[PDB]
């Protein structure tokens, strides 16, 4: 392969910077003040290295690299398993060890070594006997909690790997009894009913079919404390729920059966026929009148997204209702992975409930999405309080006319890519008529009539432009500008009519009204009124006649005014008349022939069909496909703190209070008894919790204790004794319960780093790691001074929502061209040299764009790192940052909460939104989607200096969300599978739009539109991607959602209902009922039910009593006893419920329920202490 | 004679196109066979008799 | 949930049942009196007052049950827990208090008894004669212990007492004529499983449409009829109830109940009390229905509304009537006392002298300053419901009857595996306060 010498240089520069950071990290770590004498984050460049460094076995990288090129990705796993069992990698011992190692390695290879399933999801592998039927050996797999967040596709492959391993080792099947199957059914049903709603709910027949054919056992430890009826089942050691096993069996082999059967047939495994069988068994009249019928029969509305409504989260459009979101096939610069494109104008007019990064609950393509501004598509159409109608297509007009808006007749447009349709396998909804379809028809007509060749969206030859201009009698500059930006440059209405009457193409979509949104009888009445009582000013362009003004009195118009509103026609009301202005009178009167042929209603016909039957200029359906959506989970750009904030990993016990303040304990001179580890100096004999001797200056050795005789042994003698007490023959431990004096330690640290002005220093109550090695207090002092926080492994993290980006302009991120050339950028995406800030530059795979809050936090982190290097380690400073613009060109690590591997990035700019912009490959490398997910970023040097494997929790799940290995190069072939469906074409062709009306599956035209998968393997997968829609700015619009500015629920519901009232495509009475059914009534009923079974708690102590003490005081403290659930908790949502009942048309069931709830609350507290809806209800009946 | 042959050819050109064609196109295509004056006279006579009409100035349709 | 479209239903407005001319009822004077009723007694930071109310409730319960316990002649030399230190080793004493915890060891039982003055730990050895009773006592019940004390801090007991029914009773005077009474409960009007035909046949029976001489004589001597709770199915008791309702409006439910109870003859008096699915208080004790919601059952000329619970005197005998929601607490604690035999749990409730002792389980208790659920005076007959199974037992002279239901098996019941016994009716004799006949209408269902 021949790379353009640019990608190789890019990767070489990245490696140079990584080595530069590692040099100082290694020089600092070798002084001896830290748990290890070397850096604890190994670096790898491909999947083989990650698999070797995560689960082993040693020497697997070479074999993996050979076999992947020889056979492929899938079969190399089987070959590695075969080699492992044969003993080519050493002697492991028992067969359980071989089985466990083989399963872990195979799963790591198949999952590409990123998801933490092989390390933490699988707990044990054991060989068991069928003691109930035949006493034959069978293989069992044990699962843990972390498997519940490992993805559906990773749970299913574990069963396949276990089956292959048990087949290879020479074992028998797992033969269960009826009690086992009944227990599994009961467990699944109980889990769904009690703890969490499963994403896929299988029927008991499916569960029995699955349990009767799986050759391995799927068990695990108890995760939830919910008892099950069936008990004492042989071979199962617990009587509580086993969440991991049931979630695997429900969301793997069942939910993802198609992927599993694909893998099975590709690999060649035998014995999985039942899954294949289950998969295969589970699966006179006008033109537009018939298309609507076929559309409804083949695609039906879905209301799964609107089932639940939370107060403060409005509903924007009803399922498949005109007036909602229009559908436009395309991909913007900053959308496409799972992200929608939305005009900023409709963000404002919905009371700013939508900001950049807000998640939507979509209906048609998938389940969720993220919003990103696109300023080229259309915006809302509004009706003012004086009767005027406007089209809002820009930010400023929306900012100006917001206060005068009475109704939102149309929301606007949504840009959804074709790759989403391919990924989710959704039938193609018929396409609306837009600019690019029209421009393709235009160029095709020119080619067919005058033999002139032109190409949209590019630069054409001058001779062809001149010839076309001569044949069309227009300015060549206008043609050149229209053919390269057909979405921002539009012709006047007379030119559109001329094009339609000369070339034969339909009318321009900009001047086409929503003709199919009204019935033909209304148009007939409007025609009669316009013919009878209207004044029209006519004009002339070249022979052609077009209207210029319409003035008709309001009394004669009558109810026909609603037809104009439903047609989306701008007009004004003044002095008792309605006036239609220049560009829209022609749009209204040209499709009707300037009142030269009479409009008559005809059965089995639509408005556009009647227009096209008798007219010279034809039309197309501007609006035929609509999509609904709902709000959920606003954007996040905050920091990351432990539940009580922590700044040092030093145990303090209860000597610091609730806040766990070490400084407070030092001030009072308290003595704390905590569980900690000590070190011993070889020469002087000092004992303490530090690593370097305060007197000698040498490194100390760990002390091992015996829990019975309490004898101390250094590390050397412990290794000599094989970590066992000679007198007791018991296992030694590295920690013991000891008493420490915080004052002396704090004073020593303060004198060590010359930091004195600290008011608070927060630690932890007790350590979770097995070693229980504490952190130096100087790091905590510096962290407190610089106001930064710490995580469970010693690193500092920042969490933000992720959004895609492929192309950018230097002016959006505040970076000059000179800095870009210093970074390495030299050309734009069309090949021209980089000289201006307005050009568009393609983005490199590992370059990221941060937010401004991220910059503000990382500036503090950089100051902390510099202070640490200067004072604690005695080394030169590294960052030297005074403003956040000084971090441009440095490195970070990206991580996801369910992974054990990170990826290195570079900072090139900042934006003003609350999202994290990066290349789609970057997010795919974290096994992540751009539909409302949040990831983490941390500075590289901080991670290298401060991360340690000794601080990690001992329990399963402690290695999740930790940088165990980081990747330095990005390869699209080993990132994820969703990004392989992303379309990278400049513009969709005519075949797509023509095949859209036939309701074809997206798999029938994958060869027409180029995708990422077609470039895999070749050097062209790193550069050359394209986009369909442009955007002026990627951070234009509101930044914070309105949901964060509201505290009370009454205000939330009031604003939500106002938004529902404003929008035509939302029925406010339906919203009022859903709120009561889903958020308000359940809370009131639950609180009223829990008030009479509550507990009582003392204030001084925290003892819980199941019934009140008789004397009214705590038996021990003597303090006051308070309630747990109060009267204020059963009445907070009652006024809002009464208002909903009294102002909105809800059903009688809900009214009576709320009235009885009010009566019940009034009645319970009886012995302790004319216009209303309840009184009218009880008086009417 | 030449006019009789030319009108049929112009009718043939406009027939297959099935839409309005600019005068420059017919002038360039029929220019080699016939001089400009004869083409203009033929267009005027065809308009006078009436089988074609002129929607926009300079564009001719059946 | 999801409420669907409107539906059309009937409210039994054309159902007329007439008296049979072949039966002439006997003329007997009527002696009924409502001895006890909740409405007879007349009982800033809110949390303070609520805590005070609960404390006063439990103090009142302790005082009442102590006054009951002290009537036992074998109970003497009672000492206060706070004054236990004065007790000598040789001297034996008695302590009376509530029960906080009951834990089982390999050598006996260990309790925690709390009084108004202190809390002490009690040890009952496994060889004690009264050991099985201590293994079945529910928490929040007033018990008594007898034994010695230790300076170590453990009270060593050798006897255990409960407030029970006395073993001797006086023979009441006879009656000039014989009168019967009918006990029913759990009608559940408005449900899809409500047995209309069985109830119509029951109404035809009370009007003298029979085929046997014994039934002819029984129907002519019935003067009372008692209904205890769950007269309607209510609305919003559990999610998905709309799809299981024929009449989804509570006003029309009470209208249908009144229309269907207007065919009871004039010479029969009815006593109706609230339940758990009715328009009443959300926690026991319940004063009465809501007048504005349950008006149609107030206008019947031969019906008087009672409370949950209430005591009714009929010709000199006391009838204790409650819905009986406390049977679920006793079943969940003591092993072996399953459903389908609701008599033994009732015996336990009677011999603890409290209708719902446990607090914090599956029975709600309202914050009242005084405890009205203590059985102050020993009754003659106790009636309950809420379990949907018929049973009858006798304990030391009193009769315990659980009226069946008129609602067939539902999906919720067959999920939890309980089989109801629909359409079973007890007939009691006032002179003896015993069930003498059970009527069966399950064939028509
Ligand atoms: Fe009931
Ligand atoms: Zn030393
Ligand atoms: Zn030892
Ligand atoms: Zn206390």
Numbering used by the authors:
A (entry chain B): 1 to 283, 309 to 1194, 1205 to 1216
B (entry chain C): 206 to 267
C (entry chain A): 166 to 208, 218 to 619
What do the authors report?
The structure of the Rpa2WH–PolD complex was determined by cryo-EM at a global average resolution of 2.9 Å. The Rpa2WH domain interacts with the DP2 subunit in a region that lacks any known DNA-binding domains, previously termed Accessory-116. Interestingly, the Rpa2WH binding site is 55 Å away from the active site of PolD. Surprisingly, Rpa2WH binds to PolD via a novel binding surface different from the canonical interface with PriSL. Indeed, the primary interactions with PolD occur predominantly within helix α2 and strand β1 of Rpa2WH. Residues I474DP2, Y475DP2, E476DP2, E492DP2, Y496DP2, V527DP2 and R567DP2 from an α-helical subdomain of PolD are splayed across a complementary surface of Rpa2WH comprising residues K229Rpa2, Y230Rpa2 and K233Rpa2 from helix α2, residues K222Rpa2, T224Rpa2, S227Rpa2 from strand β1, and residues E261Rpa2 and Y264Rpa2 from the β-wing loop. The chemical nature of the interactions at the interface is varied and includes a network of both polar and hydrophobic contacts. In addition, two pairs of charged residues are involved in interchain electrostatic interactions: R567DP2-E261Rpa2, and E492DP2-K233Rpa2. Furthermore, a focused 3D classification step in the cryo-EM data processing workflow revealed two conformationally different populations of PolD-Rpa2WH particles. These subpopulations (named class 1 and 2) differ in a displacement of the distal side of Rpa2WH, pivoting 7 Å around the Rpa2WH-PolD interface.
Replication Protein A (RPA) plays a pivotal role in DNA replication by coating and protecting exposed single-stranded DNA, and acting as a molecular hub that recruits additional replication factors. We demonstrate that archaeal RPA hosts a winged-helix domain (WH) that interacts with two key actors of the replisome: the DNA primase (PriSL) and the replicative DNA polymerase (PolD). Using an integrative structural biology approach, combining nuclear magnetic resonance, X-ray crystallography and cryo-electron microscopy, we unveil how RPA interacts with PriSL and PolD through two distinct surfaces of the WH domain: an evolutionarily conserved interface and a novel binding site. Finally, RPA is shown to stimulate the activity of PriSL in a WH-dependent manner.
